[PDB]
Amino acid sequence: GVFTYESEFTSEIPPPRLFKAFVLDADNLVPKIAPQAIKHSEILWGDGGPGTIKKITFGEGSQYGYVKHKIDSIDKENYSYSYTLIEGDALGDTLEKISYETKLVASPSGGSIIKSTSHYHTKGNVEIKEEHVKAGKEKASNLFKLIETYLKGHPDAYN
Numbered sequence: 001g002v003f004t005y006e007s008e009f010t011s012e013i014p015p016p017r018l019f020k021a022f023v024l025d026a027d028n029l030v031p032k033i034a035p036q037a038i039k040h041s042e043i044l045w046g047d048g049g050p051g052t053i054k055k056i057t058f059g060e061g062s063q064y065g066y067v068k069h070k071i072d073s074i075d076k077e078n079y080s081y082s083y084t085l086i087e088g089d090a091l092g093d094t095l096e097k098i099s100y101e102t103k104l105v106a107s108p109s110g111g112s113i114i115k116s117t118s119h120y121h122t123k124g125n126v127e128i129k130e131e132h133v134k135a136g137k138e139k140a141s142n143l144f145k146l147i148e149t150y151l152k153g154h155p156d157a158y159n
Contacts, residue, residue, distance in 0.1 A: 002099075003128055006117040007141055011148035015104030015112040018147045019079035020158040022102070023048065033146045035059065037139070046071065054083070065089055072099070079104030079112075090132060097121035114144055 011018070021029040027041040039059030046052030050071050058065035068087035074080065085091075085098035099119035106112050118136065120128050151157050 001122055001125070003120040003133060004117070005119070005133055005137065006115070007137055008113070008115050009141065009144065010107050010111050010113045011144075012111045013148045013151040014159075015079040015106065015114070017151045017157055017159045018112075018114075018144075019076070019081070019104055021147055021150060023074055023081045024076070025158055026054075029147065029150065030056070030143070033150050034143060037143070044068065048074070050074065053086075069100070072101075075103075090136070092132075094122045094124075094126040095120050095128060096123040116140060116144070 027043070030038045031041055037058060037060075038056050040057040042055050042057075044053040044055045048054075048071060050073055052071040054069040054071070056067050056069060058067075066087070067085055070084040070086060071082075072084050073082040080101075080103040082099075082101045085100055086096075088098070091098065098121065101117040101119075103115040103117075104112060105115065118133075118140070120133065122128065151159065
């Protein structure tokens with residue numbers, strides 16, 4: 001009853017810089033690099049640690065479009081991030097518990113590798129739609145390629 005999807009890519013920007021921006025600065029990194037997807041970010045629980053809850057908002061239009069992220073684990077030393085999503089118009093009336101996992105590393109060419117993964121938990125006996133899970137792979141991957149330019153252009157970004 002759970003879906004498992006993983007991705008793998010790399011970048012020339014350092015993972016500790018993109019990590020701090022993605023986890024320790026996602027409140028102003030996503031709404032600044034891509035203001036077309038998220039419009040605001042306000043942690044609802046804790047402050048980013050495990051068990052915390054972040055309320056990300058979108059601005060695709062007037063209709064309110066936001067989601068809730070529950071931090072699951074973090075690796076400021078390995079540059080890894082893991083949280084659980086509980087809200088999101090994309091969950092349709094079938095999905096419920098969402099699991100999100102992201103990991104960063106370094107390559108032999110100096111660049112840095114980025115491994116991401118996500119899961120779904122539908123309530124009852126239903127399944128997600130490829131166009132949905134597949135489209136999410138581009139919404140999460142494309143963003144990762146936007147942050148790489150964030151540090152590749154901003155040598156001061158939390159650095």
